[PDB]
């Protein structure tokens, strides 16, 4: 069995290997990359996402979100407070302000220490889930707006034709912006490209050990667990690496820098934080190997998780027994 310790693997495809996206994902899996839940892909030196980032300031962040924490430094939740609209140029100036800018630090490890010590005492502002793309249309390789759609994958594998679309989303971050512990909708894959700016640190639990993280989360968040049998779908709970180590939960960590892709694999729980002002693009995708994970994915039916239109069909076709309850949670 490849990668039996479930380490995060880093790939360096050549320009030739970068042509066929599906083939390269299958290659990484042949080497055991999915066992980690996360992989890093460094694009060939000849590749670029677009020519420059000099003209992005006028993109609108319609509903910036202030991420307010509650709890203790290593075990906390966050809620998202809506703020007034602002442009990317306005948001960048805000991220760089004395109130929000990255503090002086020695290296990524020192910054990680400062994040877990101090995150809860501040409320950073995030642009999230902004439909759009920063890939140039002429970028043919690994262009996250030109991938094969999940609806087409389901049709190819299972024969069923369904409604729905699959487009990418932009994220604008600043120091201490935080992504809570979660798997993707329907335990899909994700791909994330860091277009510009400061890094993102990721934490990940191997898919084969995801239920260990779920059991710890039920212990640490006991009222939320009573409220919903899939409350991590709410995407609000944080647990630090020190707490995970104290509780014996298997995990790994890695820092993504600008110009790098990260792939999350089905049922790989992940969480993390941004180091400073940045912009990322991400989208969900599927392969044949996902189908079995989609069929088994937990679902939130309490009303909190509310998701895209296109998840309806996935539930309806892959999880018909659950469909009526889940749809009630959507309405
Ligand atoms: O950029 C982001 O905020 C978050 N990305 C992910 O959790 C992902 O690609 O799965
Ligand atoms: Mg612009
Ligand atoms: Ni994710
Ligand atoms: Zn719920």
UniProtKB/Swiss-Prot annotation:
Residues 8-50 form the JmjN domain. Zn(2+) binds at residues 228, 234, 300, 302. The keyword Nuclease does not apply. Its EC number is 1.14.11.66. It is found in: Nucleus. Transmembrane segments: none annotated. It is an enzyme of class 1 (oxidoreductase). Its cofactor is Fe(2+). Binds 1 Fe(2+) ion per subunit. Its main location: nucleus. It comes from the Eukaryota. The keyword Lipid metabolism does not apply. Residues 136-302 form the JmjC domain. The modification PolyADP-ribosyl glutamic acid is found at residues 16-17. 2-oxoglutarate binds at residues 126, 192, 200, 235. Keywords: ADP-ribosylation, Chromatin regulator, Dioxygenase, Iron, Metal-binding, Nucleus, Oxidoreductase, Transcription, Transcription regulation, Ubl conjugation, Zinc. This is Lysine-specific demethylase 4D. It comes from Homo sapiens (Human). The chain holds residues 11 to 341 of 523 of the full protein.
């Amino acid at each position: 069995a490849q990668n039996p310790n479930c380490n995060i693997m880093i790939f360096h495809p050549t320009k030739e290997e970068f042509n066929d996206f599906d083939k390269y994902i299958a290659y990484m899996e042949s080497q055991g990359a999915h066992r980690a839940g996360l992989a890093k892909i460094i694009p060939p030196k000849e590749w670029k996402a677009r020519e420059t980032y000099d003209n992005i300031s006028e993109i609108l962040i319609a509903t910036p979100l202030q991420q307010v924490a509650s709890g203790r430094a290593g075990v906390f939740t966050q809620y998202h407070k809506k703020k007034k609209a602002m442009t990317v140029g306005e948001y960048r100036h805000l991220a760089n302000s004395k109130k929000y800018q990255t503090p002086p630090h020695q290296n990524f490890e020192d910054l990680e220490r400062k994040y877990w010590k101090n995150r809860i005492y501040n409320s950073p502002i995030y642009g999230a889930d902004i439909s759009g793309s920063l890939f140039d249309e002429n970028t043919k390789q690994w262009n996250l707006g030109h991938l094969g759609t999940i609806q087409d994958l389901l049709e190819k594998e299972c024969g069923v034709v369904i409604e729905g679309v699959n487009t990418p989303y932009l994220y604008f971050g600043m120091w201490k912006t935080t992504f809570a512990w979660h798997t993707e909708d329907m335990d899909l894959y994700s791909i994330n490209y860091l277009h510009l700016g400061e890094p993102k640190t990721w934490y990940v639990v191997p898919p084969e050990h995801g239920q260990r993280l779920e059991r710890l989360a039920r212990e640490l968040f006991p009222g939320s667990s009573r409220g919903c049998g899939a409350f991590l779908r709410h995407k609000v709970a944080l647990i630090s690496p020190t707490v995970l180590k104290e509780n014996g939960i298997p995990f790994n960590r890695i820092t993504q820098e600008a110009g790098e892709f990260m792939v999350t694999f089905p049922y790989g729980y992940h969480a993390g934080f941004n180091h400073g002002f940045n912009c990322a693009e991400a989208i969900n995708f599927a392969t044949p190997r996902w189908i079995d994970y989609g069929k088994m994915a937990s679902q939130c039916s309490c009303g909190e998780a509310r998701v895209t239109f296109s998840m309806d069909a996935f539930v309806r076709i892959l999880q018909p027994e659950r469909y009526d309850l889940w749809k009630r949670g959507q309405d």
